[model samples]
Target: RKEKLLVLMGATGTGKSRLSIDLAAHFPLEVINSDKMQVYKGLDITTNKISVPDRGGVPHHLLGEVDPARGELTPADFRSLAGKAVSEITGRRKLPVLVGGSNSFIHALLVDRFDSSGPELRYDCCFLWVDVSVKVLTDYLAKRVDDMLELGMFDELAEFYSPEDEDHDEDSATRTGLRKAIGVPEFDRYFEKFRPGDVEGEDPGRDRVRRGAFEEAVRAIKENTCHLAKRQIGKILRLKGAGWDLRRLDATESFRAAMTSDSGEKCTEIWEKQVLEPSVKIVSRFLDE
Candidate 1:
């Protein structure tokens, strides 16, 4: 139990990735991604994963590890991989930051540690809840959907979307590879009409077909993402309800203030003071014990 783990729970687009990377810069840390979709390859842009250049050379693990075509990982499988990842990081005596939006995965990993004697043997763990206001977060989510579309999220969906892929049964649909994501099912009407072999830029007919449902699809994506963020809030609350110690950081204020700052250096300064320093103190306090 010499190594400590920091679990970052947050809604999508709440800057968990950026925060974890910044924390890594200030400490001996490595990040372990726990998102279900980010585990798959070939959907990088749509997954909103931090690009290599922007990671600032921080080491990241368990991202793009599975082939989207054939890999199917159960929660138990993820727990096993997480155990190994956590062990590897801890073995190096560096902190492992488990950063992702998969609430169930995070819940299972932390909650399952209880034994007949209560909590069993393991490294020290801390939960940091990245909280944001509903209005600001929803607005951020809408803008994010637009950003994803601009980044060719449609093309990424095209690679997997087929009319035959549709599943009306909710239970069964949840088991599918692509359905794990918000936009996939929410934009089903758009994908259903999209031709299998069609390319977004090469064909003008594709635009005509999409034009009919494009606006609605965009709306669905934005609204569904906001709903998902709300659901994430419930899950985070449940963590506290379940008797786990969870800390919260107000991301909306810090991120907004940083963005509106006078200059790039000032923004970085605010970020370090508001977000990075607090996180560093959290981990440092745990380790110094």
Candidate 2:
């Protein structure tokens, strides 16, 4: 019997990671993160990585495994890494669930003809795309950035940035990795002006200017994140057009309710009805086939 692969695709903040973990309850599967930024080590909050407790005991491969100091992981590199992860997972008679918003990585592993003469994908694949309305996702992503800042995202970025670090240098090959993540670059000016230990002096005007720079950095992060979500959605659509057969599951309603509701139980109820149940049915049929 051929090995089977399950892929979860979506824009950022669409609950792709949560859905993967939820699906794990029904399938004997392990997750392989396909997000380019999340693969690199450090900047966990900036990259919006799922917490350990949130993984629900599911084994994850290639999540924060690569050292950013090493350099960027090209698409060719991801294919090799992910290919091996899939082989190992399937070797143990478990499914491999590839989850993330990095469609280029997904395309590299599953669709790209790396050798031009090699066989196509060896596994029977099933794709579940968690989709949300762009408007709703924009609002949600903006709020998520605010939440991250409240969760000490700035502290994490402060730790990562250093004036002496070559990774912060422009056009430096070292900058191509995790240092190049959204939050890092956006905060460069702010970090240059002030660090965590820098003492605030009697110059109230100077402090005001520093605070303005910090706020600007935060705004840049939110704007860039929303832009990234739109780009990711476009790539997924392109992949579908290329014959990937992605089955889309809309979670717009769930997200809308989630934004307005104060109760976790209410959001979960909407999510199960709108996203989880249909996904489970789709996977069940795919597995049976």
Candidate 3:
């Protein structure tokens, strides 16, 4: 009498989100987002949320539900929400697919209780790790940051940064929003160099040129993202050591052909075959048993 769960665990930029969206397209499932950033109401582009049209008409839970100004959510908050989502989804005879790069939320769901005294939470759960090489991921992350910069990531950041936030880790800092995201701290220098209202001496033509300092910020964000991915891997290892049944899937296994697809359908087919199909089988068997 166990409810089934399918967890997609991977680092940022490793394609975990895309895989989950595609899985929902072919499966009778509802998505429960586990990402902390995605839980906030705004900053979709910065947080890398799945576009509405790209969701393939599947329902997703707990995405952008929390206020960005006060997102100090503990593991218990996630645990409760996840429990409700799972119960509700299963009641409708649909699968609850938990997907994200967040380590804390995933760990909370795996434990019977939030405290140290509780035992492991068991269900018909299949944890899948979307694995990618460190080198490949590094390149992808750097390129992603560059793209975001082109898309005005700096403007999005300007709304948040302040001179008073120089000591960003100050105790007075709020525990909400994308404050803890990798790019914020990395772009500190960039913000330092550029201000929102610098009309005192700024010429219109100066705005068109790419600043050297911004390039440095891009590099910083890329490095920090790589570090974040490493931390995610460490957390995965910790959970595996704690006896979580996690199966690793090499994401690079079919990327060469999939990435070279003419349309987008070929890549979708590859993901369907390599990631979604195997995961479905695993979850199905777990529930069948």
Candidate 4:
């Protein structure tokens, strides 16, 4: 029966977008985004958003269709609109290719119903877990974002630090909100070693300094997303408890060779093999039955 939903999940940068692109092209699939950030307009690169062009005529829905500044869209609002979209798509008998890293929205869809008046929309769905080691993902995000920053890809995230938040006289990095970010255990060591002046002051060396602080900050922000991946997995574990078809696949579990940094030591195979891989299995089999 076409009564079931196909849900694919995984950490960031593990080729979910690539798989989605291919799937939509091959089937009667109309893709829908499940990732929180992908719904926002201005968040393209870092969020690993799949561009419309990438869809290759495979109908894609619910992407860059919301205001990023409105704060995270409420579950109820997401439910209201997403339910409508899903109904409209599948109603036409087109394959609904719902895709994204946002398990919560997907969970709401699978558990909550449109106009059904329930906390969850209980729909039969096939969940595909895109499993990539956190260590590799973290490192990949770090390097990719670092490269992007080096090329000045995203000029918007600069808003992350607002001196106005501290004192009207906050140091640019402080006023920028990066002040407290320095204290985050993940970035504390690297942040401490950073010198704001070296990265700025009218001259950012083109080929001079091989690395810079702004570069580090960019990597850290990307690294932070990996943390979100862990948090997301935790959420999925809870969802798994409710009984769902969750299967794990790890196609991007290895490093890209250039992601080495101070904290790069954390990217050992032991972390992925002994820790993350096992967790993926448990979350699916034990929690997501």
Candidate 5:
């Protein structure tokens, strides 16, 4: 008998992690992270990884479990690891919730013969796509970058930065690992100029230079994130074209409210009404099937 898999796919900041945790309250399931970056250690702020406390005591696999220095985890590597995670989850008679924006990893895990015959699904699968308006999402992503700055993203990156390391360079040979994270490369030039003691007792001129570089790095991060979101949406659509039955849940309204409202309660109300309830209903029927 094939084990069932629930996939929650969406662009960055679409609340895939939040929704997965929320769903866990209603189902017996463990989340398996499909995001390539999130699989690696460190850069918690830049990668936007869910904190241990925020995971709400639900078991998560392959999240921050890899050594970032080991280089990229190829699609095949992810396939093997995720397959093992799925087996373990199913062995315990619980659903496997695979959630991430990485469609490449998702495709590798689900498609049996990727390069041989036409695509064939490897398990009983249900796909839930969380979608929002790109315009709104663009604005939200920009604001999120600002929020990251406030959340000590700079301090995290500074500690990770190595001025003498070629791997930190954008065109360096070691480009496949954690350095590929959106914030890392973007801040390379900034960090190079702002290194410790280099700007000690900061002269006005030096301070201005540092500020300019910082702003540019922040801008680059925001732009790259928006570009990534677009590419992710395209990949999911391609999967649908390839025969996956994806149930799209439009959370545009909830996001819109979130952007304007100061109260989490109001946003949650809209989300529960539009996205959460439908998701629960769909999954309930899927489990019965």
Candidate 6:
């Protein structure tokens, strides 16, 4: 047991749950959920939760235990649950490993810690966030719906990912998962049958955005049965003012290595340039220290 707490957080799906078990096997630990969706009763694939069996038998607390239908997951409720979990861990002489990306629950955990009394704690939380274009998220949501419709994983996908009404016009982001995987929020906005007002002929940013949307929906869809999922990542950089601890991992390099972005293209150069290099730097510095 130690007097410190370790929190692993990132964007939506950067493999936090996958790492908790490895940390626990070597230390005094208990892993708990601090992500908003992870706590839901049965909203799985949409939330991208790592399955329990896949957790390498590592114990997880407060996951898949709430009713997904209800949205009353208040911060106070999270703080209360967190306190109970922390108390249980300390009482049992085990370290609680809170792994999640929900800023609300994670921050609530810390605020509750000293909210009772003491110096305001400032944790350099690794706010791991994937710098995805909003366009990508739009494509992802759209492609997910289509893929699930085809593959029959309807229960969860239809509930959360599907648009509530046709009026919502979820294309682009929902258009192609790969395009969504490739683009992001700032890149474009997801809208229905809307067109941008005329831009000077020289400026085709809107056209590029539209083209990205179209290709993801048409070309990418016919090629693959499943939606693209590269956006499932997170950043642990401290919240905004807390500054960034992240290094961008580019997806474009993989596209360049291949004639087109085939499966191998996604894996080949991307692993080496994006994931491996930055991670090596971080690990190397730590080992050197």
Per-prediction TM-score:
0.84, 0.93, 0.84, 0.65, 0.94, 0.51
C-alpha lDDT of all candidate models, in order: 0.73, 0.85, 0.73, 0.56, 0.86, 0.49
Question: Per-residue lDDT of 1-289 in model 4, one digit per residue for the tens?
Answer: 2244556677666656666665553356677777766676653544456666776877666677777545556556666677677777778876565677666567566664444344444555656666666677766766666665555443433433232332333232332211222113223333344422235457556424335544554555665666766777677677678766567665453344325553345544533563345434543453334
Clashing pairs in 1: none
Q: Say what the RMSD of model 2 is.
A: 2.8
* Tens digit per residue, CA lDDT, model 2, 1-289: 6678999999998999999999989988899999999999788888889999999999999999898878888878999999999999989988899999887788788863675334356668999999999999998888888888899998888877777765443521246777767788778767778876787866556878887988998898888888888988998888778788889999998888788737388789999998999999999998887
Q: Which lDDT tens digits does candidate 3 get at residues 1-289? A: 7678888888887787777776665578889999977887766767778888988888999888888666566667878888899889999988888889888787776666576334367566888888777776666667677777788777887776778754454221343446666667656655555666554375556554336666676776777788887888888788889887788877664444343425267766776687778866766676566
Give the per-residue lDDT digits (tens) of candidate 5, residues 1-289.
Answer: 7889999999999989989999989998899998988999889999999888888989999899899778788878888999999999999988999989888788888886765223478889998999999998888888888888899998898888886777545632247767888888888777777774465474466667777888898898899999988998887789878788889999888888888637398789989998999999999999997
Q: By TM-score, is 3 or 5 better?
A: 5
Model 6 Cα lDDT, one tens digit per residue, 1-289: 2234456655443445645664455555777888765676654543456766778777678887876455456667777887688668757876666777666677666652544332133332332233434344444445544554445433332233332333233344453221222222212233232223323367656777766664554444423212233323322333544553444443334324332326364545564565445544543343233
Candidate 3 worst ten-residue window by lDDT: 167-176
lDDT of 6 at 71: 48
Over 4 Å off in model 5, which ranges?
114-119, 171-174, 200-204, 261-263
Between the candidate structures 2 and 3, which one is better when assessed by TM-score?
A: 2
Query: Which one wins on TM-score?
Result: 5
Give the distance in Å from residue 46's predicted Cα in candidate 4 to where it truly belongs. Answer: 3.3
Q: What's the lDDT of the predicted structure labeled candidate 3?
A: 0.73
* Two-way TM-score contest, 1 vs 4, winner: 1
